[PDB]
Amino acid sequence: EKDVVFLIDGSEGVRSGFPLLKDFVQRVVESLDVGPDRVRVALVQYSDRTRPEFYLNSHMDQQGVISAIRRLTLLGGPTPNTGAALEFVLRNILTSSTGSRIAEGVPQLLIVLTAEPSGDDVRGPSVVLKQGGAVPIGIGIGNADISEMQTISFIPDFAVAIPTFRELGTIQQVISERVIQLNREELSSLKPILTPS
Numbered sequence: 360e361k362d363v364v365f366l367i368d369g370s371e372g373v374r375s376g377f378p379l380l381k382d383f384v385q386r387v388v389e390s391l392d393v394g395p396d397r398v399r400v401a402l403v404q405y406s407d408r409t410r411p412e413f414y415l416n417s418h419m420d421q422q423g424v425i426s427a428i429r430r431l432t433l434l435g436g437p438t439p440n441t442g443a444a445l446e447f448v449l450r451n452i453l454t455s456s457t458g459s460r461i462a463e464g465v466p467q468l469l470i471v472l473t474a475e476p477s478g479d480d481v482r483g484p485s486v487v488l489k490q491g492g493a494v495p496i497g498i499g500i501g502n503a504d505i506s507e508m509q510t511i512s513f514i515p516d517f518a519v520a521i522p523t524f525r526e527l528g529t530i531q532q533v534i535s536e537r538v539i540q541l542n543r544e545e546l547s548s549l550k551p552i553l554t555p556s
Contacts, residue, residue: 364452379527500521
């Protein structure tokens with residue numbers, strides 16, 4: 360059992376790379392055992408606002424999730440306010456009412472993809488998410504800030520920096536491997552790192 364949420368920068372900085380991002384998300388999902396009693400998948404786009412695209416309880420199989428990803432259109436917007444988006448996910452998407460099994464101790468894995476420095480502070484939100492049971496993996500593309508992605512990530516090791524959307528496919532296996540590593544037992548041995556700025 361895993362709840363896997365993709366939080367995707369949909370600001371204008373991502374417009375040209377968005378089809379490659381959609382491809383990447385599908386590559387990860389295809390590796391997961393998707394179903395209500397196994398892996399649940401959600402996806403939220405964000406810029407200076409958030410837009411849930413589908414929730415952990417929306418689909419019950421691989422076809423449903425993949426079809427939903429394929430149909431995404433870019434949210435748009437000037438900036439990625441990543442900190443606000445992270446808290447929005449914690450408080451609204453990692454919830455029992457929207458299909459999260461957080462209350463039962465199911466891993467809450469949050470894969471964040473962005474291509475620019477955040478338009479807001481991610482430090483405080485990162486603390487709140489780690490204290491609240493989220494396990495984030497920050498994937499910074501291009502101009503994304505390395506420190507920010509490390510800060511967001513449950514521990515810095517989990518963060519990834521890749522120079523272009525073109526290279527995003529080259530990390531799909533290690534992201535899949537991380538999702539596998541992070542079961543309830545492994546997470547039991549892992550503690551998050553909190554040392555803001």
